[PDB]
Design a protein around this nucleic acid. Structure first.
Lengths: 94, 47, 118, 59, 137, 173, 77
RNA sequence: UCUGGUGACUAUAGCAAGGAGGUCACACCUGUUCCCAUGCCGAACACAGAAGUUAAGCUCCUUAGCGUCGAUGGUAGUCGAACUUACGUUCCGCUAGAGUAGAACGUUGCCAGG
RNA sequence: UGGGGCGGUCGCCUCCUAAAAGGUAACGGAGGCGCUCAAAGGUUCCCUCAGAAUGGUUGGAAAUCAUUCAUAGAGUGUAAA
RNA sequence: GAUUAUUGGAGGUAGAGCACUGUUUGGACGAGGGGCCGGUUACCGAAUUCAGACAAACUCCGAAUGCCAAUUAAUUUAACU
């Protein structure tokens, strides 16, 4: 329940997004009270393992840069045709 | 349904064509219309 | 069953009326209101949302227990003199959602008698 | 209140033998044999019935 | 044999085949399902054949849902005659499916039985298919 | 005879309900006495006679209802007067009702007579009437075909128990 | 055979002047059936539901409420 | 600166529910003599009053319950270009709808009393 | 006139085709007009849906009558918008 | 006159969606016929609801681009009678 995240810089284009998805990463957001809205990237395999161990509706204390945030999953965009995840929204419950 | 030509008594002319249906209004119909010979509204009547 | 209120119906009718009715600083609106006992009159220029003169049956300058109708007559005379100082020319009479009968008719006829140009 | 077309109804003396139900009116204007003062001083035409003597339920 | 009881317009434009599935891409009623992988029309007889072949292998066992209905009629001139003297007569009814679309769902039966039955159904269809389950995670 | 009801406002209701104030009390609002269809494909004079009968029954000229449609299964169109009604509010309402309660059940010949519950839960009755207790003033002497009536008593009530509390005042529950 | 070869002459409906241009005192602004666009200040409404200017000025399309629109003309010059 | 009257703002303003209030106002209220009126009725309108009530309407307060508004990020579609003929791919730009976080139980101009 | 013939059609109005201005073809897909009204016109005042249950003399279960939601699904002389 | 930049505006396409119209798949719920004595039992059609789908002649929504035009500014050389 100790995921990591790397912050996406500004203006990610289509090409770099799909390169990131060709790699094992996935884009995500973090919003909610306690922090402002931030756009990040996450490893798909590690996220899947965390979900396997904690459950769909569970809490994760993931690391964003310097700090850590307790967070729950709100929604996720998924590609059923190649069975991979393509986006994930994180909600800070605090 | 037919056409009808109205006629004044003092303006001495007929420049008002209207329409009516016989079975609902068979009688001759009369109205007040402005014929400009006399410069007033006068009683025109079907003919 | 339920009893309806009267003023919202009045306001619907008044909104339907005031679609070709407005003040322009030379034909201002003469708005009227009556609840159950008194009557109120207000001159308005609707181009700016501004009012110019006001009068009422409970204004101490005119307040008695005569008829509920001669009171409206006095209100008409009063607002007429109040507008006689300025903008006593042809105006537009806004009856609200009320008939032109009784108190409103008396008020309007008084306003006409007191020198207004409508 | 539209006068002319309504019927004629008036508070006749509906003094029944049972409770004196003098709370009726209409065109049953018989000869004024009895004009009770507590009731209407009018026709006694509603003078007796089975109104308040023995009901099916409240006999 | 599946078709609507009535339609406002009998003659229609033939649909579009470009793109991906607008909806119906997840199993909702059952445990297992057959997802499409290519694009084509399905003609309301193919559905019947697949349903029969998939039913008899389960032997009045589990339950089957058909997530597809042919709403759209297609026309045909009977004999190859001259072009252009009006549009032809209705010949059948079709549904259009794009990649991602679920076609059949099954429940109340084992996984291997579901796989074999849906294979038998797939061999009766004009489109490539793929066995899938309920989504989790 | 309105003072009977004026006392019954508290003889039963302020006791059984214990209202916070006097204005939140149920109260009769209108009496509608709509007669019936009586399809006058040729019975127009009969409907006129029935209208005269209702004029004898009540102190108001009935207003006559036309067909609102051209419903099939019946030879009629929009127009075609096929009903009549009267609406009573005050003194006529009470003068009619005090007589009606007196002459109804002795001429109805039934213990219950009406219903245990014919209400909608809003203070309405929907009473059906076979036309015998009415015309106690000019009885069956000349008329030929009997009639039926459909009466409703719309009140300020909002339920059936309050309507029953009111029917305690000269009613057959 | 067939029985579908009919159509009517298309009427040249729609906007005829734009938001922001000057117009004269009888110019047409919008031809339509009914009132897609209502009339506003110094704008009329004809028997064909046609919208026209009463005076000379610039034309402004604007909303009326939540789901309606109108035209207005203003005499700035 | 409380209420009322009258106007401007896309319901962020509404609907629903709960709780308090009144002769400065508001209202239900009493009645049909007169003006006036109900394709029957003083229900409505209109008229004359102020015996009574805050119950209802109306005002204030509370709730995001329904409705309304609604980002970020991502996606679909698409302009242009380049591959190309694949029920397409790639690069650049515009960036939807739906959904989610969330907002909001109205803002404000003029006038008279208070 | 997807050769011609047989067949069908020939003017006008409304939709879709039509590619978010306008316009845009086919022997492309759907329908209507060749009038009606002395009030169904003008003006001044007033008024407002069906359907749904609820419920009752009738009851077509629904015709009429009565409370409340209904958002034009009412209705608008005549097709569709 | 043309192109671009910045602005304003008309519009309902692609796409999405089911709030109207129509089409549709499962599931519940309970009411009317029904299997019976005016009724049980099952089965029908309808309504209300739950979740999912479809639409050239459906739209609560809605682009890109194209269109009109600006005190209009920068580069170009057409435009009109």
């Amino acid at each position: 329940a100790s995921l990591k995240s790397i912050i996406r810089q500004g203006k990610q284009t289509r090409s770099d997004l799909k390169q990131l998805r060709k790699s094992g990463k996935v884009p995500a957001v973090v919003y909610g009270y306690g922090t402002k809205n931030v756009s990040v990237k996450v490893d798909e395999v590690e996220f899947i393992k965390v979900i396997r161990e904690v459950g769909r509706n569970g809490v994760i204390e993931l690391g964003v840069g310097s700090k850590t945030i307790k967070v729950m999953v709100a929604d996720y965009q998924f590609d059923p045709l190649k069975n991979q995840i393509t986006h994930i929204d994180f909600l800070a419950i605090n | 349904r037919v056409n009808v030509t109205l006629a004044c008594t003092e303006c001495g002319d007929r420049n008002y064509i209207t329409t009516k249906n016989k079975r609902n209004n068979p009688e001759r119909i009369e109205m007040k219309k402005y014929c400009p010979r006399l410069n007033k509204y006068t009683l025109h009547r079907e003919t | 069953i339920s009893k309806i209120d009267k003023n919202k119906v009045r306001l619907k009718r008044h909104a339907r009326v005031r679609t070709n009715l407005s003040g322009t600083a030379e034909k201002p609106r003469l708005n009227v209101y009556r609840s159950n006992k008194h009557i109120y009159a207000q001159i308005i220029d609707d181009n700016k949302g501004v009012t110019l003169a006001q009068a009422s049956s409970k204004d101490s300058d005119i307040a008695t227990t005569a008829t509920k109708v001669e009171l409206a007559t006095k209100v008409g005379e009063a607002i007429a003199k109040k507008a006689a100082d300025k903008g006593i020319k042809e105006i537009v009479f806004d009856r609200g959602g009320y008939l032109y009968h009784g108190r409103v008719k008396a008020l309007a006829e008084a306003a006409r008698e007191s020198g207004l140009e409508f | 209140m539209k006068q002319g077309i309504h019927p004629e109804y008036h508070q006749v003396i509906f003094l029944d033998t049972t409770t004196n139900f003098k709370f009726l009116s209409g065109s049953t204007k018989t000869s004024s044999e009895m004009m009770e003062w507590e009731d209407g001083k009018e026709y006694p035409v509603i003078r007796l019935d089975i109104s308040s003597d023995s009901h099916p339920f409240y006999t | 044999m599946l078709l609507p009881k009535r339609v406002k317009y009998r003659r229609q434009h033939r649909p579009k085949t470009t793109g991906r599935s607008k909806g119906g891409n997840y199993v909702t009623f059952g445990e297992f399902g057959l997802q499409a992988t290519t694009t084509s029309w399905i003609t309301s007889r193919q559905i019947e054949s697949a349903r029969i072949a998939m039913t008899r292998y389960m032997k009045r066992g589990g339950k089957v849902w058909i997530k597809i209905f042919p709403h759209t009629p297609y026309t045909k001139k009977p004999l190859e005659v001259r072009m252009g003297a009006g549009k032809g007569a209705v010949e059948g009814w079709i549904a259009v499916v794009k990649p991602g679309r679920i076609l059949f769902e099954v429940a109340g039966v084992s996984e291997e039985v579901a796989r074999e039955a849906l294979r038998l159904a797939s061999h009766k269809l004009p489109v490539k298919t793929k066995f899938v389950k309920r989504e989790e995670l | 005879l309105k003072e009977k009801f004026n006392t019954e406002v508290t003889e039963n209701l302020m006791k059984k309900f214990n209202y916070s104030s006097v204005m939140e009390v149920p109260k009769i609002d209108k009496i509608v006495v709509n007669m019936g269809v009586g399809d006058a494909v040729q019975n127009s004079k009969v409907l006129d006679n029935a209208v005269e009968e209702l004029e004898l029954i009540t102190g108001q000229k009935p207003l006559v209802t036309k067909a609102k449609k051209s419903i099939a299964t019946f030879r009629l169109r929009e127009g075609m007067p096929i009903g009549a009604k009267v609406t009573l509010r005050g003194e006529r309402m009470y003068e009619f009702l005090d007589k009606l309660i007196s002459v109804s059940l002795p001429r109805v010949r039934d213990f219950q007579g009406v219903s245990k519950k014919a209400f909608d839960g809003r203070g309405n009755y929907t009473l059906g009437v076979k036309e015998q207790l009415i015309f106690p003033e000019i009885d069956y002497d000349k008329v030929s075909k009997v009639r039926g009536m459909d009466i409703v008593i719309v009140t300020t009530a909002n339920t059936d128990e309050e309507a029953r509390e009111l029917l305690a005042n000269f009613g057959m529950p | 055979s067939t029985k579908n070869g009919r159509d009517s002459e298309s009427k040249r409906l729609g906007a005829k002047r734009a938001d922001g241009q000057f117009v004269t005192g009888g110019s047409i602004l919008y031809r339509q059936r009914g009132t897609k666009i209502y009339p506003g200040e110094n704008v009329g409404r004809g028997g064909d539901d046609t919208l026209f200017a009463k005076i000379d000025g610039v034309v402004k399309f604007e909303r009326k409420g939540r789901d309606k629109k109108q035209v207005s003309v203003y005499a700035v010059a």
